[PDB]
């Protein structure tokens, strides 16, 4: 479906700053956030591929200032099995 973009932050504050900068940076959709325990939280935006490719690279630059950024990655087309299995807000 739509392209996927993720920020993983060791901390809720840096994740909220990244999730704010991503949806202020392009036309993406903050579908939610994943708490993997231990203080790691992952903000997930999801839209067309140029928008998320700009939004994650803006939210990373705005989240490295106020927190610890673990991983940033953009998938231009996730497989249908990933969106069916993993919870990215596009499960039919």
């Amino acid at each position: 479906a739509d392209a996927l973009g993720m920020i993983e932050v060791r901390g809720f504050v840096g994740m909220v700053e990244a999730a704010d900068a991503m949806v202020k940076a392009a036309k993406v959709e903050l579908i939610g956030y994943e708490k993997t325990g231990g203080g790691y939280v992952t903000a997930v935006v999801r839209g067309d591929v140029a928008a998320v490719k700009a939004a994650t690279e803006a939210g990373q630059r705005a989240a490295e200032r106020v927190g610890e950024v673990v991983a940033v990655h953009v998938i231009p087309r996730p497989h249908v099995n990933v969106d069916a299995a993993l919870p990215l807000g596009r499960t039919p």
Binding site: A3, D48, V49, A50, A51, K53, P76
Partner: protein
């Protein structure tokens, strides 16, 4: 792996899209989509590169030609972000930066005005695009590397009212036959040469 040609056609004009769809061995491009051409040496390694396109984005391939020495891949899709993402994934799988492409060097460019009928019979037996009628001006163009010739097609139709007689982006040298009335051919010649000469790269 040597990256010869890397050109991103931002919007396919209808005679180029129609000519590619007349010649391509694959999914035919439609006019309006974004497109991308990557040529590497050696040839068969493009089957790695094509996979890196088709696993990454939603783009569709038309021309994958592994000829006698080189290899050429076209990918095309509506969203220009999709084709730019496929281009970034191709250039990561090649492990090259973009500007490692060969700079296109115009070898032969010539406006042959008021072509006799006898030469049009040969040119029309040696071309699959538009015809050429007797008395209409012809524009022959040779570029090295070959793939940049389709850029020399695209921008040409983006300028004026010409007929795309031929473009070959595969082989040793890229060929371009344009045809039409004289003012249209002069505008297309200026636009095609300015399109090719503004593409940077290694020499």
């Amino acid at each position: 792996i040597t990256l010869r040609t890397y050109i991103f056609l931002d919007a396919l004009q209808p005679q180029l899209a129609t000519f590619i769809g007349k010649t391509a061995r694959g999914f035919l491009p439609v006019p309006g989509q974004a497109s991308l051409w990557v040529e590497i040496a050696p040839g068969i390694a493009i089957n790695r590169v094509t996979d890196a396109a088709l696993k990454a984005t939603k783009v569709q391939p038309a021309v994958q030609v592994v000829e006698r020495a080189y290899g050429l891949l076209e990918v095309h899709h509506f969203d220009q972000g999709e084709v730019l993402a496929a281009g970034s994934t191709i250039l990561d799988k090649l492990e090259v930066r973009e500007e490692g492409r060969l700079k296109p060097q115009v070898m032969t460019h010539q406006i042959i005005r008021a072509v006799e009928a006898y030469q049009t019979q040969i040119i029309n037996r040696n071309s699959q695009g538009m015809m050429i009628l007797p008395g209409e001006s012809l524009f022959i163009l040779e570029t090295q590397p070959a793939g940049y010739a389709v850029l020399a097609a695209n921008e040409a139709e983006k300028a004026a009212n010409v007929h795309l007689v031929n473009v070959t982006p595969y082989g040793a040298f890229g060929r371009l036959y344009l045809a039409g009335s004289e003012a249209e051919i002069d505008a297309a010649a200026e636009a095609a040469e300015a399109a090719i000469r503004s593409v940077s790269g290694v020499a």
